[PDB]
């Protein structure tokens with residue numbers, strides 16, 4: 001394949017802004033809402049619409065050339081792959097101006113929080129077990145893991161966990177579930193990444209051209 | 223606290239038959255749209271409705287007491303945890319009479335298939351990278367991985383892969399995508415599992431009672 005492959009989230013919080021960024025950089029495209037493959041109508045570019053969780057691996061494995069992903073999901077999967085004894089690698093091209101959030105430890109509102117030591121021995125529900133594990137190890141706090149892919153915020157009220165480690169932007173979900181944010185462990189935004197192995201001279205020149213436009217678009221949006 | 227925790231799939235192929243099995247074993251509960259927890263109204267049992275992928279880890283980590291899960295997902299996650307250097311453990315209580323399927327290697331219809339050696343050097347898309355990795359290592363065949371959580375059958379058409387490793391029941395999806403099943407690598411059905419650490423006397427007696435009914439229900443179904 002001589003067409004550049006770019007992976008983006010098929011459906012979720014990054015989808016609309018990923019597509020808009022590309023169009024604003026002059027990548028015109030044809031999208032069918034329920035389909036894996038979309039393509040560019042004016043440039044030699046294929047757009048792969050996938051579950052966001054898959055994007056880091058597709059870049060690490062060299063299946064696609066570029067990807068737009070939240071830093072949180074990138075780092076979680078990098079840590080996973082390293083812990084499996086692999087050597088995931090990627091180039092960070094740009095931190096983007098959307099997808100802001102923070103991965104934070106949160107406790108029930110009525111809870112005594114003085115200190116990080118207050119998490120000692122607690123069951124902590126999260127979709128980010130590697131990120132959580134690393135933070136807690138680095139701070140010398142022992143805990144019990146509960147991995148849930150969704151509905152993390154309901155785990156305490158369901159008595160499955162004492163606390164959560166979950167993504168927060170506005171804080172409305174925490175408040176709706178009578179939880180309070182006590183400690184940020186990771187700050188995230190969407191980023192543009194590239195696979196490790198060198199592209200052809202033609203594909204790299206196309207990436208270079210796109211990157212100049214990304215920069216110009218972000219400057220014009222301030 | 224004191225209520226037995228049973229994890230089942232929130233929404234997918236195992237949900238209906240998991241719920242039916244429990245009710246037929248005399249666990250009464252209402253399943254409406256609870257985000258995570260449903261309470262038995264006649265027994266001290268909580269039903270946790272979760273993504274099926276999370277069930278093995280919830281059992282390994284001791285977050286819940288029982289779980290109903292496909293052998294394929296159990297084994298995939300067991301292998302992942304072992305590759306991280308952990309020692310995941312569980313008790314198998316019963317192989318159940320639903321969720322039958324096979325994980326198979328499949329190629330485009332117009333493809334020359336003589337041998338397993340025909341997969342040498344091919345890019346293979348799958349949602350079960352650990353199961354695939356183990357099979358291919360056992361048979362001494364080198365390959366390139368592509369992990370996709372969904373739309374696996376579309377990967378060859380999207381030029382992301384040369385072949386797939388995916389779940390098959392009726393075979394209609396393979397046929398719809400002009401693929402043919404060439405080699406079964408794993409046979410699966412739903413199973414009932416229990417966490418490793420001993421339950422309280424009360425909880426174990428309740429599990430024992432449920433198990434007698436599971437046996438009786440399956441006998442009465444053929």
Ligand SMILES: N=c1c2ncn([C@@H]3O[C@H](COP(=O)(O)OP(=O)(O)OP(=O)(O)O)[C@@H](O)[C@H]3O)c2ncn1[C@@H]1O[C@H](COP(=O)(O)O)[C@@H](O)[C@H]1O
Pocket residue numbers: 009010011012013014050051052053069070071072073099100101166167168169170171172173174188189190
């Ligand atoms: N607030 C966010 C949020 N903000 C930014 N992002 C980023 O958007 C990415 C994609 O999020 P998605 O929910 O679409 O992805 P997914 O839920 O994992 O779904 P799939 O593609 O796997 O099907 C995340 O990995 C983050 O990088 C967020 N992702 C999830 N949330 C959740 O959105 C809800 C609202 O947040 P508040 O404003 O604080 O109440 C809460 O449940 C938050 O946990």
Ligand SMILES: N=c1c2ncn([C@@H]3O[C@H](COP(=O)(O)OP(=O)(O)OP(=O)(O)O)[C@@H](O)[C@H]3O)c2ncn1[C@@H]1O[C@H](COP(=O)(O)O)[C@@H](O)[C@H]1O
Pocket residue numbers: 231232233234235236272273274275291292293294295321322323388389390391392393394395396410411412
């Ligand atoms: N046919 C099956 C199938 N049969 C049995 N099972 C079992 O059912 C489990 C749950 O499957 P789901 O699709 O509901 O799981 P999921 O989408 O991963 O669910 P969540 O993560 O959302 O909880 C699988 O892990 C298997 O153990 C199957 N799982 C998936 N399929 C797929 O169903 C489609 C139709 O299959 P054919 O009849 O052969 O055309 C194809 O895409 C198949 O890959």
Ligand SMILES: [Cl-]
Pocket residue numbers: none
């Ligand atoms: Cl079309």
Ligand SMILES: [Zn+2]
Pocket residue numbers: 030031032
């Ligand atoms: Zn179209």
Ligand SMILES: [Zn+2]
Pocket residue numbers: 032034035
């Ligand atoms: Zn269509």
Ligand SMILES: [Zn+2]
Pocket residue numbers: 051052053
């Ligand atoms: Zn996701």
Ligand SMILES: [Zn+2]
Pocket residue numbers: 252254
């Ligand atoms: Zn009801």
Ligand SMILES: [Zn+2]
Pocket residue numbers: 273274275
């Ligand atoms: Zn699943």
